[PDB]
Amino acid sequence: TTDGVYRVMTRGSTQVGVGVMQEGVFHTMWHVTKGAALRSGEGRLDPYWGDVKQDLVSYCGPWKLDAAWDGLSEVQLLAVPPGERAKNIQTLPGIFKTKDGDIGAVALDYPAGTSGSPILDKSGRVIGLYGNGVVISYVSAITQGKR
Amino acid sequence: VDMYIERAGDITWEKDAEVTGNSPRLDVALDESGDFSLVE
């Protein structure tokens, strides 16, 4: 239940994604788990909230992450690729311009099992999750939920 | 189908981090299935 970044694994074992544990709630992207329950050691994590359009899902309680890109500063992707230790990748986001407002985006292309990796601001707050995007090269929205 | 999680690290900013990637400005639409698409 410890705060941190976790791999999401399936059963040989494969990494299907990544998620963020914070305040006893596990956060990942809907397309990683499709809402399935997760095993954590001898414990079980059950889905609590989810939304396909936002491509987000929380386990054991409501979404907790609320920081947002400031629109000027570089950010770090805390990538956790399959078979590699977690690593920080710094970048200046671009922008998804939509009809309901702008969303930060990062033009970083990591393996699919990296989906759900957190994106951080300078204070270490999670401003969203990596792995829902478009192709121009892949560009990921910085996907954040509502607390 | 056993889906399970393993801790990989703390969430922290690292001063010594690799820096890469450009910053494209893109018009996109988001449909009901959560898929982004380019718009012109």
TrEMBL record, chain A:
In the UniProt entry, which residues are flagged as the active site? 31 (charge relay system), 55 (charge relay system), 115 (charge relay system)
Show which residues constitute the signal peptide. Answer: none
Q: Write down the superkingdom of origin.
A: Viruses
Task: Specify the Peptidase S7 domain's residue ranges.
Answer: 1-147
Subcellular localization, per the record?
Answer: Host cytoplasm, Host perinuclear region; Host endoplasmic reticulum membrane; Host nucleus; Secreted
Subunit structure, per the record? Answer: Forms a heterodimer with serine protease NS3. May form homooligomers. Interacts with human SPCS1. Interacts with non-structural protein 2A. May interact with host ANKLE2; the interaction may cause defects in brain development, such as microcephaly. May interact with host SRPRA and SEC61G.
Q: What does this protein do?
A: Binds to host cell surface receptors and mediates fusion between viral and cellular membranes. Efficient virus attachment to cell is, at least in part, mediated by host HAVCR1 in a cell-type specific manner. In addition, host NCAM1 can also be used as entry receptor. Interaction with host HSPA5 plays an important role in the early stages of infection as well. Envelope protein is synthesized in the endoplasmic reticulum and forms a heterodimer with protein prM. Prevents premature fusion activity of envelope proteins in trans-Golgi by binding to envelope protein E at pH 6.0. After virion release in extracellular space, gets dissociated from E dimers.
| Descriptive protein name | Genome polyprotein
Q: Which residues of the full-length protein are shown here?
A: 1514 to 1666 of 3417
